[PDB]
Design the sequence.
């Protein structure tokens, strides 16, 4: 159609099922707009937690003549989801893994129709995988990619009638990403190693036993997997 998306959100779009997208903390509604303009979805919901992004989303939907196809809603996380909604995809992008985890856990009652989740985590994706496990979700695909020098992870999950247990390594590194360790996987975890050794340059070993035990364990895990 009209809108151009970054590679990060275009990658997310390739996992959308037909029907309705609910985009939580939406990018000015640009992902739902793109999804409808490109015939990936026929309807959208754009959730925003504060007024500025809310009004920008309303403006952009109007400007793209999609008022009757994308509902822009003000509320925190999955609170925007209403009981009459029929939702085929929930997208939560451009957030840290812990925030996406808290949105899904706090909003777990909104997942009863078992939509596909497409989550794009900026950092600490382990917390998100822990939460998906707790919610009877199963990771079906993962992408790890780079844009403007920042490495992002995309996690695609669907409901399972039994809880799917992941190992510590799977939770931290990704059960799909671990089995397909591409250049961006290596780059990400080498950078994390550098960051963890750099913290050890700033912490006296006499004064930070607890924090240093966690950092040294994390280093050992990454050094084993790399
Ligand atoms: C970094 S931007 C991400 C924008 C877009 N999803 C993307 O991937 O580029 C984070 C957006 O999420 C919104 N946000 C943060 N906390 C939120 C929450 N609890 N519920 C909904 N939106 C939230 C912010 O206000 C902001 O609009």
Sequence:
């Amino acid at each position: 159609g009209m809108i151009s998306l970054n590679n990060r959100l275009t990658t997310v779009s390739r996992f959308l099922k037909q029907g309705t997208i609910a985009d939580i903390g939406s990018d000015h509604a640009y992902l739902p707009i793109y999804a409808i303009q490109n015939h990936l979805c026929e309807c959208g919901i754009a959730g925003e937690v504060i007024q500025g992004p809310f009004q920008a989303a309303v403006k952009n939907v109007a400007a793209n003549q999609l008022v009757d196809r994308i509902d822009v809603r003000l509320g925190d996380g999955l609170s925007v989801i209403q009981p009459e909604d029929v939702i085929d995809n929930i997208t939560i992008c451009g957030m840290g893994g812990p925030l996406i985890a808290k949105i899904l856990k706090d909003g777990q009652d909104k997942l009863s129709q078992h939509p596909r989740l497409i989550l794009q985590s900026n950092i600490q994706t382990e917390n998100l995988r822990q939460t998906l496990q707790q919610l009877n979700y199963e990771i079906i695909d993962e992408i790890i990619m780079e844009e403007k020098g920042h490495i992002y992870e995309i996690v695609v999950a669907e409901y399972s009638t039994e809880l799917i247990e992941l190992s510590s390594d799977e939770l931290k590194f990704g059960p799909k990403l671990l089995n397909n360790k591409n250049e961006y996987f290596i780059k990400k975890w080498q950078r994390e190693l550098e960051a963890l050794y750099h913290i050890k340059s700033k912490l006296n070993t006499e004064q930070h036993h607890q924090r240093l035990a966690q950092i040294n364990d994390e280093i050992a895990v990454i050094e084993r997997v790399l």
